[PDB]
Amino acid sequence: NRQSIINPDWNFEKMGIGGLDKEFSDIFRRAFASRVFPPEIVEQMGCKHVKGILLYGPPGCGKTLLARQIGKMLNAREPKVVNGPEILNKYVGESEANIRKLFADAEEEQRRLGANSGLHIIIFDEIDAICKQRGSMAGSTGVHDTVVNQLLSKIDGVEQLNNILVIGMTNRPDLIDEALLRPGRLEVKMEIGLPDEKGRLQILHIHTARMRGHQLLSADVDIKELAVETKNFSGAELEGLVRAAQSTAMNRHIKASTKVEVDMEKAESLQVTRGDFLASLENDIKPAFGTNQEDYASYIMNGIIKWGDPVTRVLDDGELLVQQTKNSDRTPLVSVLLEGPPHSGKTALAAKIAEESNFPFIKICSPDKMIGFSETAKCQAMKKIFDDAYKSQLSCVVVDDIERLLDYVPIGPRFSNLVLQALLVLLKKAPPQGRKLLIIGTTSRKDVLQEMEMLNAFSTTIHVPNIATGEQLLEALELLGNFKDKERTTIAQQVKGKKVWIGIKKLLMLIEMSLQMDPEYRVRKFLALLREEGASP
Amino acid sequence: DRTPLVSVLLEGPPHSGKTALAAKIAEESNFPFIKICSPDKMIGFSETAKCQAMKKIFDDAYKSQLSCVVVDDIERLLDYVPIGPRFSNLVLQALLVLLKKAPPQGR
Numbered sequence A: 001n002r003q004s005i006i007n008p009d010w011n012f013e014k015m016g017i018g019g020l021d022k023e024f025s026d027i028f029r030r031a032f033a034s035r036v037f038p039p040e041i042v043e044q045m046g047c048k049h050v051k052g053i054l055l056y057g058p059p060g061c062g063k064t065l066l067a068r069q070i071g072k073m074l075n076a077r078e079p080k081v082v083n084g085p086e087i088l089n090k091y092v093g094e095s096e097a098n099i100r101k102l103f104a105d106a107e108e109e110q111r112r113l114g115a116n117s118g119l120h121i122i123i124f125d126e127i128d129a130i131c132k133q134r135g136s137m138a139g140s141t142g143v144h145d146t147v148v149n150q151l152l153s154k155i156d157g158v159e160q161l162n163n164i165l166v167i168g169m170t171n172r173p174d175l176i177d178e179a180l181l182r183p184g185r186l187e188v189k190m191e192i193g194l195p196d197e198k199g200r201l202q203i204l205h206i207h208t209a210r211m212r213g214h215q216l217l218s219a220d221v222d223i224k225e226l227a228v229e230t231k232n233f234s235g236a237e238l239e240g241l242v243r244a245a246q247s248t249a250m251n252r253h254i255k256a257s258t259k260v261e262v263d264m265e266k267a268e269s270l271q272v273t274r275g276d277f278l279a280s281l282e283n284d285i286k287p288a289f290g291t292n293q294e295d296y297a298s299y300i301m302n303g304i305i306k307w308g309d310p311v312t313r314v315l316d317d318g319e320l321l322v323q324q325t326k327n328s329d330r331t332p333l334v335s336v337l338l339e340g341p342p343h344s345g346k347t348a349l350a351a352k353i354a355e356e357s358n359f360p361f362i363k364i365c366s367p368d369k370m371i372g373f374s375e376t377a378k379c380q381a382m383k384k385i386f387d388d389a390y391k392s393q394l395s396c397v398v399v400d401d402i403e404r405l406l407d408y409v410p411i412g413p414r415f416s417n418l419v420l421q422a423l424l425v426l427l428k429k430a431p432p433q434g435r436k437l438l439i440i441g442t443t444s445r446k447d448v449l450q451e452m453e454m455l456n457a458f459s460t461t462i463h464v465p466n467i468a469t470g471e472q473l474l475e476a477l478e479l480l481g482n483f484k485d486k487e488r489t490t491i492a493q494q495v496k497g498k499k500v501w502i503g504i505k506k507l508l509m510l511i512e513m514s515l516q517m518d519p520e521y522r523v524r525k526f527l528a529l530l531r532e533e534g535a536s537p
Numbered sequence B: 001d002r003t004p005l006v007s008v009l010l011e012g013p014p015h016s017g018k019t020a021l022a023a024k025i026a027e028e029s030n031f032p033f034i035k036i037c038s039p040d041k042m043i044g045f046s047e048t049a050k051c052q053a054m055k056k057i058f059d060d061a062y063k064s065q066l067s068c069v070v071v072d073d074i075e076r077l078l079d080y081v082p083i084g085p086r087f088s089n090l091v092l093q094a095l096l097v098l099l100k101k102a103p104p105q106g107r
């Protein structure tokens, strides 16, 4: 006999697994090298084969698809599939009999024909329902322990059986019995991670090819655009997106308020447009998990307007700092402080500076999540964030509204002390070797921080000014453009007399409040407001 | 549309009728969601209880597309007494945080 171990009519393309391919190459190299090679060389070498494969990873990836495909790829006895904990039975000693029934046939075949038999595949799905720790599973009955012991004794006992392949997949590997996770049993273990950009492109092509073939897909569709937009989608979500888009297109030809009807004409004219894809992205499907999903639209609701010189100066300084921290050896840690009068946009400029930087790891720590936290929880949250930041090669973090992060209030003073000591030490310590860290701080009250003796721990400070000249006020108004030229001249005629001191966050409020009155009283009302509230140096 | 959050502080001498003028304005609003967070419903609570209650009310108030909420007798909500003075710090930080948080988009 010259039985082959691979189906001659096989191709890696038809398997359709997408971005795993390096994982699949590793699996093949380890699991089947011993069998592909011709007999005499291995006979001389006398190398045993591996028996147990363990696949693990988060929900919705290849794993079941991959196991179904591996089972299909070989040309041998059909696999026997076990769907989770269907082994358990209500009589004493009925579980072990069931388990051994699986391997009985392989034992017999090996014993009869010797070393020239075929291959048998046993696929354990949801293996964590069975092989939980015998030292941890509930003490109410033996059966879980005796099942584990039966499996361990049978997979690699005193009698040597070396013609069986057992495949396992799970979600929480660390619970599995370590005596099962040792060479010669379940030995190769691999992580099926979330797909990268290229993998997304592959998956999309695989699911779109058939529709392409018949010219149902409209030519405007740009797959690469879709790939770029879709961040953290898994394979399952990537399929569901396409399904939802097709459904949105197909529904267009059905009536269903009165008794259902379908147009036998337009049934011939169906196509999917890119607009359906856009629509499905926001209404129907949402990606779970993922890292980022930042709502910068909530931190920077109005973008920026370059109402004068200082905005550019500030942004230039921030860019310089980023560039420096990018390429340096002596000083792997850099810390910058932003401060100025209240209502001056201190947060928006910080967030924009961060976003222009293109570091892989960008996170903002803010008190708005921490409402009612004790003096302990805050420490935990901060420690967690910085631990995360230390993993990635490059990381930039923003700590905003320090004064509210301390619970400061002027009557005592009163503040939390633990938080301040944690903040000082976390600012001081250097990151792990070869990584680099940037920290951007925001505060309203410089002098207080100076008093607490933490101003020194920052490397440098940046001053964010507010509007100082009436000319700048006029320019900011023009950039907003909420008033007509005649109103502009009317304002100018009086405003030019004296300088003004007002922060832009208050400017917007005043404008909005002024718009509410009748047209003939707007200007005057505005003026009155600017007069009454603007009294300040 | 550009000022999703608006705040107003009714103020005056004692025994003058602040709470009533206030709940009359809320009634005439005719908004979909209206709530009143008075201090007399939480007699004998500690700090964490108060924080949780207020947090719950605002979390529900973000679910309607528009809402009105009344916070009357601040002076009693945070336990102030002239001798000292003494007060709860936690409640005050809660207020100063919640007054500056924009709701979810479009609300």
Ligand SMILES: Nc1ncnc2c1ncn2[C@@H]1O[C@H](COP(=O)(O)OP(=O)(O)OP(=O)(O)O)[C@@H](O)[C@H]1O
Pocket (backbone or CB within 6 Å): A016, A017, A018, A019, A020, A058, A059, A060, A061, A062, A063, A064, A065, A066, A195, A203, A206, A234, A235, A236, A237, A239
């Ligand atoms: N890498 C991928 N390439 C192509 N299709 C994929 C990929 N990952 C998942 N899919 C598709 O999404 C679905 C994944 O189902 P599958 O059972 O493999 O997920 P799983 O996470 O292994 O299952 P479980 O939830 O039990 O862990 C299938 O429709 C499959 O075709």
Ligand SMILES: Nc1ncnc2c1ncn2[C@@H]1O[C@H](COP(=O)(O)OP(=O)(O)OP(=O)(O)O)[C@@H](O)[C@H]1O
Pocket (backbone or CB within 6 Å): A299, A300, A301, A302, A303, A304, A305, A306, A307, A311, A341, A342, A343, A344, A345, A346, A347, A348, A349, A444, A504, A505
């Ligand atoms: N040039 C600008 N710079 C910054 N923000 C601007 C500018 N023009 C308009 N804005 C808008 O004004 C808002 C000002 O409010 P914001 O909370 O950002 O300011 P802040 O100075 O950090 O606040 P606070 O005084 O509460 O600390 C910004 O969020 C942005 O929406």
Ligand SMILES: Nc1ncnc2c1ncn2[C@@H]1O[C@H](COP(=O)(O)OP(=O)(O)OP(=O)(O)O)[C@@H](O)[C@H]1O
Pocket (backbone or CB within 6 Å): B014, B015, B016, B017, B018, B019, B020, B021
């Ligand atoms: N024109 C009015 N304005 C306000 N309240 C009025 C008026 N006419 C009658 N009232 C009545 O006056 C009472 C005002 O009591 P209320 O509790 O509002 O006073 P308050 O000053 O808010 O209480 P406190 O002194 O404890 O703060 C209510 O019963 C209200 O109906």
